[PDB]
């Protein structure tokens, strides 16, 4: 059986891993149009902050290692088109210019996504940077030590924008974050959490300019000003982290796509055409909190989809279990994690919810290491089933969100979590831990 896998990132990589243990016998070709196999864009912040010194070690696989396992790796080779009926792809070797047609028995594609750019006046004056991949990582790192860069503006206040804002504020630069949305990180956290984080960022000289539409970049040759409908900001560097666009335009007319460019797939990762599977940021995934399909562009999602595509290679036998959208990050001293439905998700999906937020020390009063922790539990008003949770503290309590992700998947209720058995030892927690305490509050609220 000959299987071709497109993409060396999270989705494509895991499909190769599951093929190696489920179909050791197969001829496997792995294609990457880029020069570098499996660079980890998630590790970019650690590199930019100087935690990791070698940009080339921020990866999880090399072509050499895969070839030792019998995989045919083709870097600098792009799959230009798919001919689904006759089961062929045309590939182009980007270093020699040679094209060729390759046949396959099964095709798994994980084409990914590309940074969204603002198509506005000034669009590409110099020093308007993006944040994805090895080349952008290197360029961003050189700007971190440049004495000419004094003011940097990042557009977008989501996960990637706040990572870039923290990295340049730690490098000693003045940062302004601009967005149309009213709160940074609203897709991940609710207002009681983002109010605390806004203060922490402002204490580290990051200005957050919310509710402003960027209209043009101004500058002579290189960017010098970012002007919005409401203001003008000096900028020596702009990082655009507004969002991501599916890399699927080349597939229009070949595979069925959603209006927004996402590939249509079912619960077995099958596309509209026989024997081609699609995985990763370019697809929608089953979202268990609301029993619907949502696009959640995370490495965890792409890796699970990748393995499920190989499981369903010959027969639709293993439907995808679904996910909860779990994410976590540190912003200066605060470490937060969240899963399931929050206010922005509930609004987008038209979902009614109830919630309780508990803010108190996570260790007993006599223990001098005690610190404040914020925990919000979101539940369904009719069934009281768990729908989401968010937590934050300067102490790392993030592994507790893993228990809430399972609770949502299992359809547990506030009563189940109020009395769930979690260990107690006073150097680690209180007799009723952070999850028990918030659920106990919800039980009182619903009496
Ligand atoms: C700065 C940053 C930080 C992130 N941090 C986290 C995090 O901490 N936790 C988390 O879970 N997720 C994180 N993510 C998200 C995560 O990186 C993505 O969800 C994941 O990489 C998606 O994998 P993918 O295979 O779908 O696509 P992509 O990563 O977009 O990879 C697509 C690959 O296929 C190649 N390709 C595309 N078309 C072709 C073609 N036609 N022929 C051959 N090759 C082709 C591309 O060159 C690319 O290498 C982060 C993303 C960024 C940018």
Structure report:
Peroxidase whose active site is a redox-active cysteine-sulfenic acid. Belongs to the class-III pyridine nucleotide-disulfide oxidoreductase family. The modification Cysteine sulfenic acid (-SOH) is found at residue 42. Homotetramer. This is NADH peroxidase. The protein folds into three domains: 1-33 and 60-112 and 246-326, FAD/NAD(P)-binding domain (3-Layer(bba) Sandwich); 41-58 and 113-244, FAD/NAD(P)-binding domain (3-Layer(bba) Sandwich); 334-446, FAD/NAD-linked reductase, C-terminal dimerisation domain (Enolase-like, domain 1). Helix content is 24%, strand content 27%. Helix 1 packs parallel to helix 7. Strands 3-2-1-7-18 form a five-stranded parallel sheet. With 447 residues, the chain is of the alpha/beta class. The protein has eleven helices and 25 strands. The longest helix is centred in the N-terminal third of the chain and has 13 residues, at 10-22. A hairpin with a 6-residue loop joins strand 24 (372-379) and strand 25 (386-393). The radius of gyration is 24 Å and the shape is globular.
* Amino- and carboxy-terminal Cα gap: 60 Å
Heteromolecules bound: flavin-adenine dinucleotide
CATH class annotation of the largest domain: Alpha Beta
List the total number of helices: 11
Give the % helix.
Answer: 10-25%
PDB class: oxidoreductase (h2o2(a))
Keywords: oxidoreductase (H2O2(A))
Assembly: monomeric
Entry title: crystallographic analyses of NADH peroxidase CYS42ALA and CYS42SER mutants: active site structure, mechanistic implications, and an unusual environment of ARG303
